[PDB]
Amino acid sequence: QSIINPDWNFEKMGIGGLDKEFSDIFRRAFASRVFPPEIVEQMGCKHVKGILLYGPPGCGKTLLARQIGKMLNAREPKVVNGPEILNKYVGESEANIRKLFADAEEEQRRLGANSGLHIIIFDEIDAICKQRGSMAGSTGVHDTVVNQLLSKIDGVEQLNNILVIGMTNRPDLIDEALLRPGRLEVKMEIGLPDEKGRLQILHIHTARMRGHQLLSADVDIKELAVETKNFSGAELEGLVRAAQSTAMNRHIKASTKVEVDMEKAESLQVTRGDFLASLENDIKPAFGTNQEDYASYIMNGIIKWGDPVTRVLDDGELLVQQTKNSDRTPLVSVLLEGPPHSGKTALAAKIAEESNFPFIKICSPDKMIGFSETAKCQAMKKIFDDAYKSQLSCVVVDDIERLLDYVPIGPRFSNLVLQALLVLLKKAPPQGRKLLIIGTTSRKDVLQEMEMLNAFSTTIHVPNIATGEQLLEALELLGNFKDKERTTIAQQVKGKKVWIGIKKLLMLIEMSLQMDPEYRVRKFLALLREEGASP
């Protein structure tokens, strides 16, 4: 009797974007159980009896496990859902574990080489397979169970009709001894799909629904696939479900009571509008970008009041192009510096947005109020680790000076964060990927003295307003003072020089605007004069 079911077919499986992993798993697990036993005996080998999987949440682990379990024409697979074998009475946990393998042992001793096949699923293997303490005083809560499992999987007796599978999210906590090639040999990683993977996933989760004419011709599947970038597997299904629900909700109503129409429900259709709506406000990707942060950092937009803003943007674009289409330098960093209130964070955010990378994350101290240095180091480590799971990335560090906890008195600061950032600004990403880091600051000399400028590859300068003409141009662009007052103000500022940042100009304008209609110009001039220059 063949191991595989007579009618099994790959297309019925319903899996997309994991062809290579499935092929390798098949090759390493089942290839030896397909040809007649004579050749297998001649080669004198033993079948593998272990598998493992891991990855980030929502990638299709349980689905693959269940599919592989169903793919075999044998007994019904057992199941264990995390700590479901623990017990309070002494020694019962080990007896429970042993009970699982009794059937396989009996089968082997009875029928020998023609025995059947059995499967098991230690789902959440991490729950009861933590590393042994290996030290007196650190007795583990679950140690006898681990020892019993290790003994049974490969002990004084041999078995060749078993197969174990595991799934977890922390592959670095499993006991070391349980990962040698004799017990758990084949282990694979499940990652985020690619464009073709997303297309396949959307196609599989739509084929059926197209059977009964439930799709208008306005749905361009290729456009929908290309639009959604770096989406986990589950989120595509979530989007489709939400779109279907919102499309169906229009025919139904309720409010005071509940009722349903019967003359319109037979012409149900789903169009691209509902899809768009939901895509916008329904599913919030986890490894992507959203306009909320940009709206929070670009609150007042960007205005081209002179030449430097264009040069800065061009330099940013050049750096982005270099990192994107280069291979000898997979790590380039740029440091933005300038006087206070010069408006430097907004330019960084604009560059990051316009870069058009799949993944963008902003690490700012706003979310770390009152933390201890250990928490800050952990957060930075987590963010940088997360940034290592994409073919293109970009990270922005905001207000470095406030991150180091600097204070001129003493001076004082936190050394651990500085050491972590210094080590973390030279760690090349995993081979075959790219990265880009953009920083900001308001005190260049301090960093130059702490021996930090040898870690950054370049540097840009963001100046202030330098001449009355640029101030007048900015005022006109904002559109607050009209021509009549513009002439009077210009007649004054034109014959001198100014030194102010745009943010301070906005605040000054706002403060001035609160006075009487015909007293605004005088107070504005007085405030501008009192501001001073202080070169």
List binding-site positions: 300-305, 340-347
Identify the active-site residue in 386, 399, 467, 523: 399
* Binding of residue 169 to a second copy (CB under 8 A): yes
**Contacting a second copy (CB under 8 A), which of 6, 9, 90, 407?**
90
- Residue 161 Cβ, how far from a second copy at the closest point, in Å? 21
Provide the mask over 273-302, with x wherever binding to a second copy is found by CB under 8 A and - wherever it is not.
---------------------------x--
> Has 399 been annotated as catalytic?
yes
- Residue 325 Cβ, how far from a second copy at the closest point, in Å? 8
Cβ burial 16-39 (10 Å sphere, 16+ → b, else e):
bbbeebbeebeeebbebeeeeeee
Residues near ligand ATP, by CB under 6 A? 15-17, 57-63, 169, 201, 233-234, 237, 299-303, 309, 340-347, 399, 442, 502-503
Give the list of residues 6+ apart from residue 365 with CB closer than 8 angstroms, or none: 398, 399, 402, 403
* Numbered residues of the known binding site for ATP: 300-305, 340-347
Please give the size of the binding site for a second copy, defined by CB under 8 A. Answer: 32
Determine the interface stretch with a second copy among 18-26, 122-130, 186-194, 421-429 (rule: CB under 8 A): 122-130
| Closer residue to ligand ATP in complex, CB, 204/455 | 204
* Numbered residues of the known binding site for Mg(2+): 345
| Closer residue to a second copy in complex, CB, 204/446 | 204
Identify the active-site residue in 12, 284, 426, 482: 426
Read off the amino acid at residue 434: K
| Closer residue to a second copy in complex, CB, 40/506 | 506
Looking at the DSSP bridge assignments, the partners of residue 500 are 465
**Contacting a second copy (CB under 8 A), which of 131, 246, 442, 470?**
131
> Has 329 been annotated as catalytic?
no
**Contacting a second copy (CB under 8 A), which of 127, 219, 346, 527?**
127
* Binding of residue 136 to a second copy (CB under 8 A): yes
| Closer residue to a second copy in complex, CB, 204/493 | 204
User: Nearest 5°: CA angle at 263, between 262 and 265?
Assistant: 65
Longest dimension (CA), the chain: 107
63 binds, among a second copy, ligand ATP, none (CB under 5 to 8 A by kind): ligand ATP
The distance of Cα 303 from the centroid of its chain, to the nearest Å, equals 32
Strands 165-168 and 331-337, sheet pairing: unpaired
Query: CB-based burial of residue 399 (10 Å sphere; 0-12 exposed, 13-18 middle, 19+ buried)?
Result: middle
* Bond preceding residue 340 cis, omega within 30 of 0: no
Instruction: Indicate if the alpha-carbon torsion angle 519, 525, 529, 534 is positive or negative.
Output: positive
Cβ burial 49-65 (10 Å sphere, 16+ → b, else e):
bbbbbbbeebbbbeebb
**Contacting a second copy (CB under 8 A), which of 322, 391, 487, 488?**
322
**Contacting a second copy (CB under 8 A), which of 81, 87, 290, 329?**
329
**Contacting a second copy (CB under 8 A), which of 23, 290, 321, 459?**
321
Q: How many CB atoms lie within 10 A of CB 324?
A: 13
Instruction: Report in angstroms the alpha-carbon separations of 175 from 50, 135, 400.
Output: 15, 15, 40
* Binding of residue 328 to a second copy (CB under 8 A): yes
Read off the amino acid at residue 412: R
> How far, in Å, CA of 55 to CA of 193, rounded?
12
> How far, in Å, CA of 532 to CA of 535, rounded?
9
Identify the active-site residue in 70, 444, 503, 523: 503
Strands 51-54 and 186-189, sheet pairing: parallel
Determine the interface stretch with a second copy among 266-274, 318-326, 383-391, 434-442 (rule: CB under 8 A): 318-326
**Contacting a second copy (CB under 8 A), which of 143, 189, 261, 366?**
143
| Closer residue to ligand ATP in complex, CB, 60/69 | 60
| Closer residue to ligand ATP in complex, CB, 107/235 | 235
Question: Rule CB under 8 A: which of 188-207 touch a second copy?
Answer: none
Strand ranges (E), 244-387: 331-337, 361-363
> Has 398 been annotated as catalytic?
yes
- Residue 506 Cβ, how far from ligand ATP at the closest point, in Å? 7
Instruction: Report in angstroms the alpha-carbon separations of 50 from 130, 149, 171, 352.
Output: 18, 13, 15, 45
Helices (H), 281-337: 291-297, 308-324
Read off the amino acid at residue 83: P
523: enclosing H helix or E strand? helix 520-531
> Has 345 been annotated as catalytic?
yes
> How far, in Å, CA of 115 to CA of 110, rounded?
8
| Closer residue to ligand ATP in complex, CB, 344/376 | 344
Give the list of residues 6+ apart from residue 418 with CB closer than 8 angstroms, or none: 404, 450
Q: Which residues are identified as catalytic?
A: 344-345, 398-399, 426, 503
Site for a second copy, rule CB under 8 A: 90, 126-127, 130-131, 134-137, 139-141, 143-144, 147, 169-170, 173, 177, 300, 318, 321-322, 325-326, 328-329, 506-507, 510-511, 514
